[PDB]
Amino acid sequence: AWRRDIFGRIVWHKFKQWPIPWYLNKRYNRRRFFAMPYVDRFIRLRIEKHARIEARKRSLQKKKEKILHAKF
Amino acid sequence: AYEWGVRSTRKRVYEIPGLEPITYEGKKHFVPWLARPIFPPWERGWNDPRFHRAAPIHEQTLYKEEPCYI
Amino acid sequence: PLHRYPVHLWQKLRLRQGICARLPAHFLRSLEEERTPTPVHYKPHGTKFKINPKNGQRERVEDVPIPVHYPPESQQGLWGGEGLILGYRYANNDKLSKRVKKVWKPQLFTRELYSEILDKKFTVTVTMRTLDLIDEAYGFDFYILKTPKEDLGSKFGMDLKRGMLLRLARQDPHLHPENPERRAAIYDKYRSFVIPEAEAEWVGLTLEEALEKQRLLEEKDPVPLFKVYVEELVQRLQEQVL
Amino acid sequence: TVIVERWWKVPLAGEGRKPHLHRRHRVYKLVEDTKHRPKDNLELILTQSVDEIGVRGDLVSVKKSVGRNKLLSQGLAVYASPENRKLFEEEKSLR
Amino acid sequence: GIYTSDRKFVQIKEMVPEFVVPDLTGFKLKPYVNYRAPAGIDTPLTAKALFQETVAPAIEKDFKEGTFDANNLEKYGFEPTQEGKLFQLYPKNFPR
Amino acid sequence: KFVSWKSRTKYTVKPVKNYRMIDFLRFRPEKEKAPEPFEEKVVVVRYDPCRSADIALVAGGSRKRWIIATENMKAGDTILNSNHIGRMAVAAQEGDAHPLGALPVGTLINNVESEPGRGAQYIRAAGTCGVLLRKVNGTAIIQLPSKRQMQVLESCTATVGRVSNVNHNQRV
RNA sequence: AACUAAUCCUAGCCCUAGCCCUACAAAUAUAAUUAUACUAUUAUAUAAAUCAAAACAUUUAUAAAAGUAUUGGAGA
RNA sequence: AAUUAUAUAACUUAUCUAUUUUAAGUUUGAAAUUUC
Structure with a gap:
């Protein structure tokens, strides 16, 4: 199933075989599938980072375009 | 009488009627924002000695009211 | 870069797309609508225009609500709009005196009230103002149902409202068990608040609860492709027969 | 109930804006607080007998907590709603 | 195997994999194929193709005869549960 | 990493890794006895590392339990523990546990409890003795080592005699 | 015509514009990345100060009307 | 030190509680200001 990790990302969680149910398994409950409040800052950075990535590739493309103009 | 055992370690x-509250049972893991489910008895389907617990003495067929001193 | 829509519009965009759009309209309206709580610690201006004494000119007026802090404990009780006013005080109420940090606490109490709809006596944190409102509302059950969420100012009260609305809506026999004649009287007494069962279910539900409920409502076990193809094959064969 | 008013006049925001509060605008004056006052009077009906405040069945005006903490808490007094008030007089009429 | 209390190893026969080796006698397929043999265009099998090849003929015959009902979906090959089969499609209970 | 060491489930007379579990509720009915007066034997007067006074092992019936030793407690002595409130003066052997009602005024006592059932908490140090200043009906006055005179119900248990090391309070 | 050296042009970036976003297996929060039980499972109070007032103390920003009326150790 | 010292703390009165016939004073001082 799709689950949210402690980093705020949504990732597919593959289920594991256990002899006891989840509620009787404290260790499985010990595993954290919830995001902490401080991840809100990270989420904004991810959106900004994605926007930054688009800018960087465009800058990278511009440098490659210089080669086209320079060669021809 | 002096009380033995530090208080720190002691x-x-x-x-609502007609409806059932939502619980994280579907999630299969605890989350603070959902209600704690009430779980029915679990059935393993086989006997595990490591987790098996001995039956009480009184329920034994050989239990006798008279005390036998050995 | 820069976000075309401000951060506050991010919430609106999320509500307009995904499971939030699929949420029931009645519940969506309840969340979207915001109603100002009845003033308690401040008096709104009676008139919208006044003559300034200095210039003798009519000027539009504005209302400044006093800041009031409502602790979560109020969400577990039934407060009649009273709240903790946190701020600074001047000793003896003269500006020439020292400033002291002050927390003003309305006197709070825990008392028991009987609910006819639920036929149970609930021990609740309540203030004297709420008791007057309950009498003005013509009953504790009436007060919970009549009072809006903001004026009620209690999650526990909202939970009672959902139960009362759900109880009234369903004509549930659980009301006053083994007294069918008495059950009808309670429904007739509070008949004004009868509403569709769907709406009553979502009254007072938290956002996390609402999203999970809608997710559960729309969750569907995967359809075995055998069944899907069997119906498709039969439909195609049946269509061919036509 | 506590009522407070800002000491410092806040510049008017106009027709459709919100004034921006400042540090001196954060200081408030206490016009009235029930805590400093003695308990205000409250109207209640004695459902039992209490010493030297009357007898069961009478309507007495007593200070809110003083009446509430002693009479109502023990159960001596009760609140008089409009519905039970009309019922009580009808019951008293039949009494 | 399982390590029980007292630090003693106890091998479990069931958990020990057994290599099922097929008989290659009479089998005409070898590691390599002729360059003389033309290659076949890849046609990955799908549920639609599998259902059409196996399940469709039975229903088509039954539909014309009229001996079709919803209750008998298992008759045409539906499995209500994977329990009872040594190899369960979901959840997978066998190794590669 | 701190775990309480006072976690022994079973009361024992053997030193515990050593700590010997002391009993400050003198009249605890031992096995195979009704809540009636019972007697015990002082097996040995041992040394307690964790207490200034020396502890004397007192055993009766099928139960053996450590207790504080009085001024004249010695090995082989017999110690009586009675719940009954004597109509007349009850025979007093130093170290015996008796209700304040049983004892007469002026008898030195130790290991007294402020409230019935509380257990001995004062006069547990070496050389400390409580004097029964006054006795009336169900109330008695006992002078604690702090010199604070307290009035308690006669149900409270008092052990006759002073604590061992009679000259501990006189140390210079 | 000498050794050490030197020579080069893009690697890429920067500012605005535009634009919100909705981009294998196996193992893992236990001791993370240890294929199955242990042990239940959980962040955060005004932001302050520095700083300015040449120190320091209330105090110190974070379309036009207009830097006007006002506020302020009436001073920054 | 001088001067104040509604941090708090106490008492008195309210307060809040029982019965039943923090604020305002004052005091300590968390401190503040000035001088040494």
Whole structure:
């Protein structure tokens, strides 16, 4: 199933075989599938980072375009 | 008498009628923002000695009211 | 870069797309609508225009609500709009005196009230103002149902409202068990608040609860492709027969 | 109930804006607080007998907590709603 | 195997994999194929193709005869549960 | 990493890794006895590392339990523990546990409890003795080592005699 | 015509514009990345100060009307 | 030190509680200001 990790990302969680149910398994409950409040800052950075990535590739493309103009 | 044992180590939505509160049972893991489910008895399907517990003495067929001193 | 829509519009965009759009309209309206709580610690201006004494000119007026802090404990009780006013005080109420940090606490109490709809006596944190409102509302059950969420100012009260609305809506026999004649009287007494069962279910539900409920409502076990193809084959064969 | 008013006049925001509060605008004056006052009077009906405040069945005006903490808490007094008030007089009429 | 209390190893026969080796006698397929043999265009099998090849003929015959009902979906090959089969499609209970 | 060491489930007379579990509720009915007066034997007067006074092992019936030793407690002595409130003066052997009602005024006592059932908490140090200043009906006055005179119900248990090391309070 | 050296042009970036976003297996929060039980499972109070007032103390920003009326150790 | 010292703390009165016939004073001082 799709689950949210402690980093705020949504990732597919593959289920594991256990002899006891989840509620009787404290260790499985010990595993954290919830995001902490401080991840809100990270989420904004991810959106900004994605926007930054688009800018960087465009800058990278511009440098490659210089080669086209320079060669021809 | 002196008390032995440091004190440090010493030990709504549900009430609404006609509806059942949502719980993280579907999630299969605890989350603070969902209600704690009430779980019915679990059935392993086989006997595990490591987790098996001996039956009480009184329920034994050989239990006798008279005390036998050995 | 820069976000075309401000951060506050991010919430609106999320509500307009995904499971939030699929949420029931009645519940969506309840969340979207915001109603100002009845003033308690401040008096709104009676008139919208006044003559300034200095210039003798009519000027439009504005209302400044006093800041009031409502602790979560109020969400577990039934407060009649009273709240903790946190701020600074001047000793003896003269500006020439020292400033002291002050927390003003309305006197709070825990008392028991009987609910006819639920036929149970609930021990609740309540203030004297709420008791007057209950009498003005013509009953504790009436007060919970009549009072809006903001004026009620209690999650516990909202939970009672959902239960009362759900109880009234369903004509549930659980009301006053083994007294069918008495059950009808309670429904007739509070008949004004009868509403569709769907709406009553979502009254007072938290956002996390609402999203999970809608997710559960729309969750569907995967359809075995055998069944899907069997119906498709039969439909195609039946269509061919036509 | 506590009522407070800002000491410092806040510049008017006009027709459709919100004034921006400042540090001196954060200081408030206490016009009235029930805590400093003695308990205000409250109207209640004695459902039992209490010493030297009357007898069961009478309507007495007593200070809110003083009446509430002693009479109502023990159960001596009760609140008089409009519905039970009309019922009580009808019951008293039949009495 | 399982390590029980007292630090003693106890091998479990069931958990020990057994290599099922097929008989290659009479089998005409070898590691390599002729360059003389033309290659076949890849046609990955799908549920639609599998259902059409196996399940469709039975229903088509039954539909014309009229001996079709919803209750008998298992008759045409539906499995209500994977329990009872040594190899369960979901959840997978066998190794590669 | 701090775990309480006072976690022994079973009361024992053997030193515990050593700590010997002391009993400050003198009249605890031992096995195979009704809540009636019972007698015990002082097996040995041992040394307690965790207490200034020396502890004397007192055993009766099928139960053996450590207790504080009085001034004249010695090995082989017999110690009586009675719950009955004597109509007349009850025979007093130093170290015996008796209700304040049983004892007469002026008898030195130790290991007294402020409230019935509380257990001995004062006069547990070496050389400390409580004097029964006054006795009336069900109330008695006992002078604690702090010199604070307290009035308690006669149900409270008092052990006759002073604590061992009679000259501990006189140390210079 | 000498050794050490030197020579080069893009690697890429920067500012605005535009634009919100909705981009294998196996193992893992236990001791993370240890294929199955242990042990239940959980962040955060005005932001302050520095700083300015040449120190320091209330105090110190974070379309036009207009830097006007006002406020302020009436001073920054 | 001088001067104040509604941090708090106490008492008195309210307060809040029982019965039943923090604020305002004052005091300590968390401190503040000035001088040494």
